[PDB]
Amino acid sequence: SKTFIQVX
Amino acid sequence: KNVLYRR
């Protein structure tokens, strides 16, 4: 389970 | 590891 956290 | 970031 890969999570793609958007930073700015 | 499974935590990938997106600019």
d(CA A5, CA B2) in angstroms, rounded, equals 10
User: Is A7 in contact with B7 (Cβ distance < 8 A)?
Assistant: yes
Smallest CA-to-CA distance from A1 within B7, B3, B5, B6 is with: B3
- Whether the Cβ atoms of residue B6 and residue A3 lie closer than 8 Å to each other: no
User: Is B5 in contact with A4 (Cβ distance < 8 A)?
Assistant: yes
Method used for this model? Answer: NMR
- Whether the Cβ atoms of residue B6 and residue A6 lie closer than 8 Å to each other: yes
User: Is A1 in contact with B2 (Cβ distance < 8 A)?
Assistant: yes
Question: Which residues on B lie below 8 Å from A3 (Cβ)?
Answer: 2-4
A2: distance to nearest CA of chain B, Å? Answer: 4
